[PDB]
């Protein structure tokens, strides 16, 4: 529906929402009440490659200068609900009993021990995250890291047949309302104080990453890149595999670099982006951008991203939950860049069988960084499929009695009621599957190559 001044008498009518929520909301609301024969490629002039950048010098001096500018940030608004687990995504266990958050933690503290920088640590978490962040952040009480967190806007999820706000038909807790996207970083970094607390200090830079990929660490090449050339700024994009289905590319239009996501790509043309032909890139969102830019753009109201509407079905009731992305910002900054990346960059942890490539000896923790195994000559990492029986971590750890060995493997799909035994080693393409009513023990110590096992 779309009345307007309707919607904005119910959204004052919630009393819970802060004056400058109210404001946020509304925009959004108001701006959201392609022609792809014009899509372009951005030159390797606006989108750099890394290897042509300028590594620092060999005096500290120069490090120093650097990371007393910078602010890190991280995105952790998401639950761990996916994997059946309770709590933030950030707080489950990845690699040797470490969580998403210890890691980059200890690589941080890394970095300050090292240098003798204080580069602070931002988490920006939503309401489904935050008082659990909060409990969790002061174990690091002592670390030799400055520990940020921020709420991010809550706005009311809207009833999309009636068109107003669910809390104003009295849907008030929690599941009334919603997190509006990290585009909100930058509105809610100014409303925190926060980057104005980072100003009073000198800070030039955040770098925003999801906190579920491991492959985003601090890179100096890049950050350098921004501060010699002025890249108000980056998004770092990688090649586009078929894994990549879900996400964004980023494209040319009427002449300026820009996210382009589902929302925008007319229906005729959906497996056009899918394909590893038309557009050969995909964002990471492991984003660089510009503090002073933030603030500009922000005051300014010039962030006018496309919207998301991400529609969801909650105690039956259907409701939609209207959202912006990150890097779709990059349209409305200045000398902005894209800048590919190789895979290493991009990490994502989003299910139990992503776990298993990580724990495998395919990669090992080195200070702080999941590494992977070199002895893993082709770059690609094993297609990992397992069924639903391993989709809560606990369970997915109660059926590896240890991680299989899988450097020399190039694919795993298990499905069914299958349980693994310690030191297993799996090569090439492997296929477990348990048929009904049937349980698959793979034993301890067994060699698994090629192989299709279908039953006892
Ligand atoms: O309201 C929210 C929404 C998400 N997040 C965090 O944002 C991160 C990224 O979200 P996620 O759902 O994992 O990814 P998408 O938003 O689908 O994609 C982002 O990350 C992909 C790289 O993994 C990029 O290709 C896309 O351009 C970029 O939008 C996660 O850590 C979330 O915790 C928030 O802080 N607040």
């Known amino acids: 529906?779309?009345?307007?001044?309707?919607?904005?008498?119910?959204?004052?009518?919630?009393?819970?929402?802060?004056?400058?929520?109210?404001?946020?909301?509304?925009?959004?609301?108001?701006?959201?009440?392609?022609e792809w024969s014009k899509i372009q490629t951005p030159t390797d002039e606006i989108v750099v490659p890394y290897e042509k950048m300028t590594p620092?010098?060999?005096?500290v001096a120069e490090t120093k200068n650097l990371l007393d500018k910078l602010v890190v940030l991280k995105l952790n608004g998401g639950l761990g609900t996916t994997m059946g687990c309770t709590g933030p995504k950030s707080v489950i266990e990845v690699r040797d009993g470490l969580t998403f958050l210890d890691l980059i933690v200890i690589q941080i503290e890394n970095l300050n021990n090292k240098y003798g920088c204080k580069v602070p640590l931002v988490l920006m978490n939503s309401f489904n995250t935050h008082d659990d962040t909060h409990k969790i952040v002061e174990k690091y009480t002592n670390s030799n890291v400055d520990i940020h967190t921020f709420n991010q806007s809550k706005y009311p999820r809207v009833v999309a047949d009636e068109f107003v706000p669910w809390p104003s038909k009295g849907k008030t807790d929690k599941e009334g309302w919603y997190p509006?996207?990290?585009?909100?970083?930058?509105?809610?970094?100014?409303?925190?104080?926060?980057?104005?607390?980072?100003?009073?200090?000198?800070?030039?830079?955040?770098?925003?990453?999801?906190?579920?990929?491991?492959?985003?660490?601090?890179?100096?090449?890049?950050?350098?890149?921004?501060?010699?050339?002025?890249?108000?700024?980056?998004?770092?994009?990688?090649?586009?595999?078929?894994?990549?289905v879900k996400g964004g590319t980023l494209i040319s239009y009427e002449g300026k670099v820009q996210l382009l996501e589902i929302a925008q790509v007319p229906d005729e043309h959906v497996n056009e982006?899918?394909?590893?032909?038309?557009?050969?890139?995909?964002?990471?969102?492991?984003?660089?951008?510009?503090?002073?830019?933030?603030?500009?753009?922000?005051?300014?109201?010039?962030?006018?991203?496309?919207?998301?509407?991400?529609?969801?079905?909650?105690?039956?009731?259907?409701?939609?939950?209207?959202?912006?992305?990150?890097?779709?910002?990059?349209?409305?900054?200045?000398?902005?860049?894209?800048?590919?990346?190789?895979?290493?960059?991009?990490?994502?942890?989003?299910?139990?069988?992503?776990?298993?490539?990580?724990?495998?000896?395919?990669?090992?923790?080195?200070?702080?960084?999941?590494?992977?195994?070199?002895?893993?000559?082709?770059?690609?990492?094993?297609?990992?499929?397992?069924?639903?029986?391993?989709?809560?971590?606990?369970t997915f750890l109660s059926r590896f009695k240890s991680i299989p060995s899988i450097v020399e493997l190039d694919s795993l799909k298990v499905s069914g009621d299958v349980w693994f035994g310690s030191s297993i080693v799996?090569?090439?393409?492997?296929?477990?599957?348990?048929?009904?009513?049937?349980?698959?023990?793979?034993?301890?110590?067994?060699?698994?190559?090629?192989?299709?096992?279908?039953?006892?």
Not at 56 to 59: E, F, G, K, P, R
Not at 211 to 227: F, Y
Not at 328 to 338: P, V
Not at 436 to 454: F, H, Q, T, W, Y
């Open 273 to 394: 982006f899918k394909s590893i032909e038309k557009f050969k890139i995909f964002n990471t969102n492991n984003l660089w951008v510009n503090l002073k830019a933030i603030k500009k753009l922000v005051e300014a109201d010039a962030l006018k991203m496309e919207i998301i509407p991400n529609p969801k079905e909650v105690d039956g009731v259907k409701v939609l939950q209207l959202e912006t992305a990150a890097g779709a910002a990059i349209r409305f900054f200045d000398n902005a860049i894209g800048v590919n990346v190789p895979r290493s960059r991009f990490l994502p942890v989003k299910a139990s069988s992503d776990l298993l490539l990580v724990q495998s000896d395919l990669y090992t923790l080195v200070d702080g960084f999941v590494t992977r195994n070199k002895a893993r000559t082709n770059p690609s990492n094993p297609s990992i499929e397992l069924g639903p029986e391993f989709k809560k971590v606990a």
């Open 426 to 456: 799996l090569k090439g393409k492997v296929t477990v599957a348990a048929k009904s009513g049937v349980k698959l023990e793979i034993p301890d110590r067994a060699v698994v190559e090629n192989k299709n096992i279908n039953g006892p």
């Open 1 to 34: 529906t779309e009345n307007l001044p309707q919607l904005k008498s119910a959204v004052d009518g919630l009393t819970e929402m802060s004056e400058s929520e109210k404001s946020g909301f509304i925009s959004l609301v108001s701006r959201y009440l392609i």
């Open 56 to 59: 620092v010098s060999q005096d």
């Open 180 to 244: 509006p996207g990290h585009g909100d970083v930058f509105p809610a970094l100014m409303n925190s104080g926060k980057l104005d607390t980072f100003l009073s200090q000198g800070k030039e830079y955040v770098f925003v990453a999801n906190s579920d990929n491991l492959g985003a660490i601090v890179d100096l090449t890049i950050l350098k890149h921004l501060i010699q050339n002025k890249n108000e700024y980056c998004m770092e994009v990688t090649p586009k595999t078929l894994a990549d």
